[PDB]
Short mmCIF file of C-alpha atoms and ligand atoms in Angstrom, two decimals:
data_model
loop_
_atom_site.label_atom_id
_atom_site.label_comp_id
_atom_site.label_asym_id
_atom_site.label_seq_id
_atom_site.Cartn_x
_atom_site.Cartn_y
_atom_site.Cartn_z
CA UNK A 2 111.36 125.63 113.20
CA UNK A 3 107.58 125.66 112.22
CA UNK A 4 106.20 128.04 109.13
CA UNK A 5 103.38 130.08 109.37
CA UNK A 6 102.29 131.09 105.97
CA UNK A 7 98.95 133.33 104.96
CA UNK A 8 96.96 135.10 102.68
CA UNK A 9 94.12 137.05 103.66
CA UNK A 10 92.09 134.88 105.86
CA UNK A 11 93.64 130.95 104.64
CA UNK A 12 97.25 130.17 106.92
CA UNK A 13 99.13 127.29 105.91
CA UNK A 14 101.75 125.56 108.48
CA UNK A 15 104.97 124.01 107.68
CA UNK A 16 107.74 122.14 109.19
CA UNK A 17 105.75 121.32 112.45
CA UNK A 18 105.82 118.41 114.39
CA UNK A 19 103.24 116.49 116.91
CA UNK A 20 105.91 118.02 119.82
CA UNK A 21 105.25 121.71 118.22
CA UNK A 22 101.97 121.08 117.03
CA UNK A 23 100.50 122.64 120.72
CA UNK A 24 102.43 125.92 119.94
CA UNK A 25 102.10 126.46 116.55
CA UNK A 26 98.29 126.59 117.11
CA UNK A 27 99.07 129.01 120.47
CA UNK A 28 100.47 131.50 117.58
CA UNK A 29 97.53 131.15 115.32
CA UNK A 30 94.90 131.25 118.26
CA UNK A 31 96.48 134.80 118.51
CA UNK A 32 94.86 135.87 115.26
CA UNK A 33 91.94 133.01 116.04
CA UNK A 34 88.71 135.03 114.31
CA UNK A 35 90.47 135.33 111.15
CA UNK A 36 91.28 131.93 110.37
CA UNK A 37 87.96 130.67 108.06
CA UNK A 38 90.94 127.68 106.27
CA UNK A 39 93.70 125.92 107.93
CA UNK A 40 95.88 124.08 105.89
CA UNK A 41 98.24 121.72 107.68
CA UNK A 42 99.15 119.14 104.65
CA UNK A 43 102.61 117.84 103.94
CA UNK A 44 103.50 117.51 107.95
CA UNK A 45 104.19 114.29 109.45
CA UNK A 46 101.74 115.22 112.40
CA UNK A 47 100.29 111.59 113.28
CA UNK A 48 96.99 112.84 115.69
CA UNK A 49 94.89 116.01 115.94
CA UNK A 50 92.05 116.94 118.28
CA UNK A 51 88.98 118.65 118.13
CA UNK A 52 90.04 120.37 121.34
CA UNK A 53 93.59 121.97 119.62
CA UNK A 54 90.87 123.35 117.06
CA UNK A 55 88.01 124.84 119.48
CA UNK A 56 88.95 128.08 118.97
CA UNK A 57 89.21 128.63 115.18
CA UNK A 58 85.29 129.21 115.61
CA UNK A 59 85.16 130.78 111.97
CA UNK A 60 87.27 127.73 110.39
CA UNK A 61 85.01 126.58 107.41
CA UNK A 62 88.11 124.62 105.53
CA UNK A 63 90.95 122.40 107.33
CA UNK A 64 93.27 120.67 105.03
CA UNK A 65 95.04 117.34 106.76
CA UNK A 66 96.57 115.51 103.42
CA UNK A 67 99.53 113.90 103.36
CA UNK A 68 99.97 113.69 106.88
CA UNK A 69 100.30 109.75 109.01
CA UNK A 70 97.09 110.45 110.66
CA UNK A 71 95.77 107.03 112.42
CA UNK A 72 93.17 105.30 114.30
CA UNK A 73 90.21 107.42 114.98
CA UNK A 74 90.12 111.03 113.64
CA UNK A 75 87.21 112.86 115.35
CA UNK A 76 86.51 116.55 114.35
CA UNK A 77 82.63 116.23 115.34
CA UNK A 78 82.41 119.56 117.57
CA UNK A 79 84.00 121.18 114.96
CA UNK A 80 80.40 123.14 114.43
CA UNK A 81 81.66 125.49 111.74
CA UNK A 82 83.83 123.21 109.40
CA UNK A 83 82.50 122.96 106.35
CA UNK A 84 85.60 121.91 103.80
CA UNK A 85 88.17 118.54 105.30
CA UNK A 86 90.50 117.09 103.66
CA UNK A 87 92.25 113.89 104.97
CA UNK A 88 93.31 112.61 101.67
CA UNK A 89 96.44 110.44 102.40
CA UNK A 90 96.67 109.52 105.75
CA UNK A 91 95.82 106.61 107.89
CA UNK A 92 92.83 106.91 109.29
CA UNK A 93 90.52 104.08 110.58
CA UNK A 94 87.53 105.89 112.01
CA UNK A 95 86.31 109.56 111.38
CA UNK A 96 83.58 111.73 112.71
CA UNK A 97 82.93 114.71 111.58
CA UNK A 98 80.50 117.85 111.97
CA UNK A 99 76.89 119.27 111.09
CA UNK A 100 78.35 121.99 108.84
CA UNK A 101 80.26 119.09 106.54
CA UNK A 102 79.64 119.56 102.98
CA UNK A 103 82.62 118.33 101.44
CA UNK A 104 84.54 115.61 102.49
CA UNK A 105 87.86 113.95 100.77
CA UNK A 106 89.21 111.14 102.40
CA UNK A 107 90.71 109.07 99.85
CA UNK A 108 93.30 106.93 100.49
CA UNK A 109 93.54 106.29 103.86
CA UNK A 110 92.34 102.99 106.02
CA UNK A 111 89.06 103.87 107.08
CA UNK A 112 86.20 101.63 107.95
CA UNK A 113 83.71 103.70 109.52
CA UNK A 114 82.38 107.20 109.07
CA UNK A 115 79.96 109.26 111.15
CA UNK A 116 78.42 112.45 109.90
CA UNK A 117 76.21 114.86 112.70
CA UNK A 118 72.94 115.56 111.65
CA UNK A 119 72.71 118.38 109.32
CA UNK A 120 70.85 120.11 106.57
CA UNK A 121 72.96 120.84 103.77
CA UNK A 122 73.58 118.79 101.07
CA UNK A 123 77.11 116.57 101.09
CA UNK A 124 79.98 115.49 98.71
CA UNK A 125 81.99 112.54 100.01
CA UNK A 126 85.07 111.12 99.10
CA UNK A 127 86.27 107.66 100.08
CA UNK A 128 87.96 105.72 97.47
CA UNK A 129 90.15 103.18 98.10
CA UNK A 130 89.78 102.23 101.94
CA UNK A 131 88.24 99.76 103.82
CA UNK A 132 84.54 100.07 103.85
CA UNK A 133 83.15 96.82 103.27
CA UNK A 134 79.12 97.78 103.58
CA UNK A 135 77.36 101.27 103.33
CA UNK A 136 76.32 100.74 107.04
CA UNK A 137 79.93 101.86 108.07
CA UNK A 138 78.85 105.19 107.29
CA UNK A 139 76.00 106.15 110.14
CA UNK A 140 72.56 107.32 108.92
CA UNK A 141 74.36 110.95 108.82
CA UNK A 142 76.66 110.24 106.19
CA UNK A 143 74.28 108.67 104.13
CA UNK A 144 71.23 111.18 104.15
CA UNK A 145 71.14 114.10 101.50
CA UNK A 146 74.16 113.21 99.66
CA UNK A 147 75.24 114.43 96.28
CA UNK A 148 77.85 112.73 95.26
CA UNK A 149 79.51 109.59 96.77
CA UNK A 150 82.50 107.93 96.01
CA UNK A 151 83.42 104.47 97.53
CA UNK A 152 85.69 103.25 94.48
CA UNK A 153 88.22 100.49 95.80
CA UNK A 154 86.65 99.44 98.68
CA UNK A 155 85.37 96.08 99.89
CA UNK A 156 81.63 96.05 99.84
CA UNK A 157 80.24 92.56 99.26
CA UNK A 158 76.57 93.77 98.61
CA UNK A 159 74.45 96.99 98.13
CA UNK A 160 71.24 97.85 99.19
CA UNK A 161 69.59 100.77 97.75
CA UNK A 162 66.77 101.25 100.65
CA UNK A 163 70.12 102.13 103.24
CA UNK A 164 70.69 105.89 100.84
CA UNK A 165 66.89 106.44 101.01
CA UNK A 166 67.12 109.67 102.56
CA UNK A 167 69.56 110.75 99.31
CA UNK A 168 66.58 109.77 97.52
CA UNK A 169 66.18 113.48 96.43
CA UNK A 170 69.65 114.64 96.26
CA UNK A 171 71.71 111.78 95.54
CA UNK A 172 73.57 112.29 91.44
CA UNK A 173 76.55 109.95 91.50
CA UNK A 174 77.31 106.89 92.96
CA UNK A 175 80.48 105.30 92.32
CA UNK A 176 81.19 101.43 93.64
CA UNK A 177 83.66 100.09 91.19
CA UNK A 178 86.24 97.68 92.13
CA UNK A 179 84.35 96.21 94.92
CA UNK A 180 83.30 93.00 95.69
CA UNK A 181 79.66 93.38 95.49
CA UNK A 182 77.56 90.07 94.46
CA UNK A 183 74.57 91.36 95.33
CA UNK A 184 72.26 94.18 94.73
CA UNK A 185 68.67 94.99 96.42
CA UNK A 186 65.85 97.75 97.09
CA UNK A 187 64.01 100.14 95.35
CA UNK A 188 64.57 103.48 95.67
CA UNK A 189 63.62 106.25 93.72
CA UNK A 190 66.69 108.33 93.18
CA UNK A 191 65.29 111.59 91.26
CA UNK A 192 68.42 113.00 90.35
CA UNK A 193 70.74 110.19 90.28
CA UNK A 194 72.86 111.00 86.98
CA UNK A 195 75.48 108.32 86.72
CA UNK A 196 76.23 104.73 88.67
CA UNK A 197 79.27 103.02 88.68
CA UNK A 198 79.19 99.24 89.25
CA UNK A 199 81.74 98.03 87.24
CA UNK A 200 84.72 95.77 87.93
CA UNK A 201 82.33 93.96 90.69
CA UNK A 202 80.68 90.13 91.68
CA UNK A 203 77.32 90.74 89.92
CA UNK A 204 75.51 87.91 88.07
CA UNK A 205 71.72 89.10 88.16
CA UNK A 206 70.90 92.92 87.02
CA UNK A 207 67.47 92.52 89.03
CA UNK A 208 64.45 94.62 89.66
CA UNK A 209 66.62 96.67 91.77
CA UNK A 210 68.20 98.28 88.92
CA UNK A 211 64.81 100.66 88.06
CA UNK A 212 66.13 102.66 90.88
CA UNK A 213 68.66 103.67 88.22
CA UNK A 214 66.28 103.96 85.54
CA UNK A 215 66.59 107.42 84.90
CA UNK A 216 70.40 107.98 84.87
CA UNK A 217 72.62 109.20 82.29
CA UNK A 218 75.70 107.29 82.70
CA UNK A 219 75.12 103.83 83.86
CA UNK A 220 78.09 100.63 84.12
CA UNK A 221 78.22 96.90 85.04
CA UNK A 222 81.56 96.20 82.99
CA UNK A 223 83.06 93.00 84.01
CA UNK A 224 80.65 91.49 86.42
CA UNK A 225 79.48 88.10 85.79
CA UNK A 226 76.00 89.03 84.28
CA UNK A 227 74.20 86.30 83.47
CA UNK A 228 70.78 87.70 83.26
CA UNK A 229 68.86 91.19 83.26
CA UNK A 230 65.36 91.57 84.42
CA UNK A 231 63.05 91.83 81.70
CA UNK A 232 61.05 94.44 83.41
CA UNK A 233 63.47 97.34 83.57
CA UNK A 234 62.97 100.43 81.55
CA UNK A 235 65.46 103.43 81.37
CA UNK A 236 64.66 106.89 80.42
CA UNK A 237 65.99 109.21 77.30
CA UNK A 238 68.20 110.28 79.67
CA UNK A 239 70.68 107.20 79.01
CA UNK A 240 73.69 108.38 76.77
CA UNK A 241 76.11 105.61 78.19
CA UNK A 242 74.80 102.18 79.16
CA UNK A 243 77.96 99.52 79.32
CA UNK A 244 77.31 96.15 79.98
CA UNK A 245 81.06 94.54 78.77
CA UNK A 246 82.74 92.17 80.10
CA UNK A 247 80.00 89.51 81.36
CA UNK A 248 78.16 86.12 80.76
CA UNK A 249 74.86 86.67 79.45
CA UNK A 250 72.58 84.34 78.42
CA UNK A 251 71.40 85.46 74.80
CA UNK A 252 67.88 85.08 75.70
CA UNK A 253 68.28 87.55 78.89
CA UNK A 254 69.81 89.70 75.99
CA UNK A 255 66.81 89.78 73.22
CA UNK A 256 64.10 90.02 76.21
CA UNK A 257 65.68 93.08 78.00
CA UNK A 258 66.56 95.04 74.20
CA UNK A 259 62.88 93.36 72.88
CA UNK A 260 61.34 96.43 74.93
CA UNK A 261 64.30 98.77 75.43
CA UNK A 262 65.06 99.34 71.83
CA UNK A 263 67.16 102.55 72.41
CA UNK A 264 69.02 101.21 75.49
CA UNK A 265 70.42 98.72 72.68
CA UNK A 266 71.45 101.56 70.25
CA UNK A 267 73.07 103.48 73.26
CA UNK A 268 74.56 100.19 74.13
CA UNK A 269 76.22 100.07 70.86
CA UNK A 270 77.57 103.61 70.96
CA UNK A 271 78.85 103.06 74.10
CA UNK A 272 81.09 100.77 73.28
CA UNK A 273 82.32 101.88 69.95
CA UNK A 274 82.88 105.19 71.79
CA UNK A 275 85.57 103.24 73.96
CA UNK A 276 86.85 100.42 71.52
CA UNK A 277 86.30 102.14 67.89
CA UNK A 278 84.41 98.57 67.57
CA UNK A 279 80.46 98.15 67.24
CA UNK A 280 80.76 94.76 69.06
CA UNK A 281 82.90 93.66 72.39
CA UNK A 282 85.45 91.22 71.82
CA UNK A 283 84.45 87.51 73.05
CA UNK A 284 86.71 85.64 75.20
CA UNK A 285 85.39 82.20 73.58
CA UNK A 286 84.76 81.96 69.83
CA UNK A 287 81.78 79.50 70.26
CA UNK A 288 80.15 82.53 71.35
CA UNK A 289 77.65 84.84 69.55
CA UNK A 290 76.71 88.04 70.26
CA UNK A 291 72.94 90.08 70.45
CA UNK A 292 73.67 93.36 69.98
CA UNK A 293 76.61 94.60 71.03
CA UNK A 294 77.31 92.14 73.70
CA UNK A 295 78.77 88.58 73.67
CA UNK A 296 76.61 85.95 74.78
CA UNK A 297 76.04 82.15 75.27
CA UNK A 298 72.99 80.26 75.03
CA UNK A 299 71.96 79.08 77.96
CA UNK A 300 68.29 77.98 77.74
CA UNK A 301 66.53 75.80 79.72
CA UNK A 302 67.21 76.37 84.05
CA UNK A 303 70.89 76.76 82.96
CA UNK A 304 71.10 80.40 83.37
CA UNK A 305 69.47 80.42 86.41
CA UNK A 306 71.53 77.55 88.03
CA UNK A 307 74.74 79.39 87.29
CA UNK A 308 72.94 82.34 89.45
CA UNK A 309 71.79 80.09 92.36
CA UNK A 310 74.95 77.91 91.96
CA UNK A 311 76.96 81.35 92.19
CA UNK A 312 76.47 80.94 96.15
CA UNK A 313 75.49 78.31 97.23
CA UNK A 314 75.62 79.18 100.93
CA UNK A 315 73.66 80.82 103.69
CA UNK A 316 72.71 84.44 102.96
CA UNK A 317 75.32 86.63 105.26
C1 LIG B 1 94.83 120.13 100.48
O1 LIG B 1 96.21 120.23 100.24
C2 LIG B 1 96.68 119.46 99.16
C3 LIG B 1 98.19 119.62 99.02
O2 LIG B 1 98.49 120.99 98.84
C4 LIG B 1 95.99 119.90 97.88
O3 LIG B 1 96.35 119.02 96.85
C5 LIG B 1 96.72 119.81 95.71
O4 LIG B 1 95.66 120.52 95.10
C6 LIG B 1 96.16 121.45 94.15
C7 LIG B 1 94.99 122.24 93.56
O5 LIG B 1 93.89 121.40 93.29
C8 LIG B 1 97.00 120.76 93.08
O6 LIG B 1 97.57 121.73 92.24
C9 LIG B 1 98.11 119.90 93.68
O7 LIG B 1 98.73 119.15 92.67
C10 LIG B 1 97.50 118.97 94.71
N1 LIG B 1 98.53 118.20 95.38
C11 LIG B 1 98.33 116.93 95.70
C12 LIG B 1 99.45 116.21 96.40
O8 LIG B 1 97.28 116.33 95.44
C13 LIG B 1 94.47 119.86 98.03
O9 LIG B 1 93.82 120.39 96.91
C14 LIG B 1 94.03 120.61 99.28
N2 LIG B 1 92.64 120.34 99.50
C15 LIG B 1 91.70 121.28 99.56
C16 LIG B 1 90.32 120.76 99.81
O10 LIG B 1 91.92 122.48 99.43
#
C-alpha cells in the first residue's frame, strides 16, 4: 500500500515498509535516469543498502529522516550523491561518498563517520550524538570542510592540528555542550568566522586559541576559565567575544585586555547585547569584576594550581 509521489525529477515514497521496500524501488528503477532526489522520510524502514540504490546513477539528494535506521548506514558507492539526510534515526556508523557536500545527521547515535576522498567543499551536521573525539570522523570527513556542527556530543578534548586540511575552508565550528577540558594546536584557519565552545570543561584559554584569532563570533560561556594567555591577539573582525560564566583570575583578566583593548569593549557589548547589563552577574558577592567579567583574585601559584589541580591524573 506504498505511495509514489513526484514532481519533475524529486519522488517521494510513502507508506512502505522494509518487506516492500525491494519493490517500491523495482517501480522507481523503471523511471531510474530521472530520479536526481529520493525522499524516503517519515517511513519506519529500519536498514537501506547501497546496493537497493545502484541504479539511481543521477541521484544527487536522498532524504532518510525520521526513519529507525540503525547500526551501520553505508552509502559509500553512492558516487553521485551529493545531498543526505539522516536526521532522526539511529544510526551508529555512516559512510558516505566522494560527491558528499552536505550532510545532516542530527540526532541519531552515531560514533563514527567516514567521508571518501573528494574535492568539493563539505557542510556537516552532527549534533547531538555520540562522537566523543574528532578522530571518529576519518581524515575524509575532516578535510575541506565549511561548516561543522558537533553540538551535544561527548568530546573530552580538541585538537586543532586533526582539521588542518580545513585550514583554508573551514568558517564555523560549533562544540558546545561537550565535555571538552582541553584544547591544543595551532592552526591557521583563514576563514574561520565563528567558534562555539561554550557550555564545556575548559579552565586555560591557551596559545591554542590564536588559531581563532581572526573570527567574528567567538564563545567560552560557562567553562571554568581560570586564565587566558597573555599572548593572544584577535583581529577587527571580532563583533562577539563572550567569556561568561567562568573563574578568572583578575590578573589573567587586566593582562589579556592590557593589550587587547577592543576585545574588552566588544566584550562588553557582547554581553549587554544578551543581558541589557554592561557587567555579568557574579555567583559570589566577594567577587569583583575587570571589565565586564567577574573575577577573583587569585595571585600567587593559586591560579595555576586550580589548572594543574583540575586533573590531576595521567594525560589520556
Ligand atoms: C528531509 O525531509 C524532512 C521531512 O520532510 C524535511 O524536514 C522538513 O523541512 C521542511 C523545509 O525545510 C520544513 O518545512 C519541515 O518542517 C521539516 N520537517 C521536519 C520534521 O523537520 C527536510 O528538510 C528534508 N531534508 C532535505 C535535505 O531536503
Amino acid at each position: 500500500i506504498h505511495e509514489i509521489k513526484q514532481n519533475g525529477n524529486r519522488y517521494k515514497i510513502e507508506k512502505v515498509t522494509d518487506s516492500s521496500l525491494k519493490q517500491a524501488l523495482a517501480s522507481l528503477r523503471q523511471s531510474a535516469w530521472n530520479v536526481k532526489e529520493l525522499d524516503l522520510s517519515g517511513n519506519p524502514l529500519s536498514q537501506i543498502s547501497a546496493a537497493d540504490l545502484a541504479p539511481f546513477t543521477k541521484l544527487e539528494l536522498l532524504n532518510l529522516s525520521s526513519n529507525v535506521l540503525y547500526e551501520t548506514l553505508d552509502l559509500e558507492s553512492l558516487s553521485t550523491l551529493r545531498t543526505l539526510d539522516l536526521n532522526n534515526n539511529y544510526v551508529q556508523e555512516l559512510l558516505v561518498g566522494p560527491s558528499i557536500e552536505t550532510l545532516h545527521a542530527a540526532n541519531n547515535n552515531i560514533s563514527r563517520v567516514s567521508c571518501s576522498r573528494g574535492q568539493g567543499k563539505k557542510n556537516i551536521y552532527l549534533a547531538n550524538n555520540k562522537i566523543t573525539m574528532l578522530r571518529d570522523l576519518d581524515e575524509g570527513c575532516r578535510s575541506r570542510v565549511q561548516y561543522l556542527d558537533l553540538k551535544l556530543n561527548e568530546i573530552d578534548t580538541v585538537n586543532f592540528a586533526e582539521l588542518a586540511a580545513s585550514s583554508d575552508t573551514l568558517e564555523h565550528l560549533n562544540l558546545q555542550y561537550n565535555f571538552i577540558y582541553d584544547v591544543k594546536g595551532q592552526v591557521v584557519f583563514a576563514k574561520l568566522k565563528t567558534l562555539d565552545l561554550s557550555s564545556n570543561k575548559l579552565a586555560f584559554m591557551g596559545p591554542e586559541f590564536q588559531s581563532a584569532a581572526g573570527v567574528t563570533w567567538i564563545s567560552l560561556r560557562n567553562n571554568k576559565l581560570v586564565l587566558i594567555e597573555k599572548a593572544l591577539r584577535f583581529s577587527q573582525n571580532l563583533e562577539h567575544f563572550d567569556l561568561r560564566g567562568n573563574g578568572f583570575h583578575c590578573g589573567t583578566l587586566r593582562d589579556f585586555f592590557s593589550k587587547n583593548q577592543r576585545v574588552q569593549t566588544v566584550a562588553k557589548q557582547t554581553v549587554k547585547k544578551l543581558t541589557g547589563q554592561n557587567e555579568e552577574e557574579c555567583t559570589v558577592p566577594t567577587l569583583g569584576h575587570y571589565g565586564a567579567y567577574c573575577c577573583e583574585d587569585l595571585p600567587a601559584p593559586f591560579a595555576d594550581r586550580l589548572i594543574a589541580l583540575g586533573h590531576h591524573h595521567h594525560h589520556h
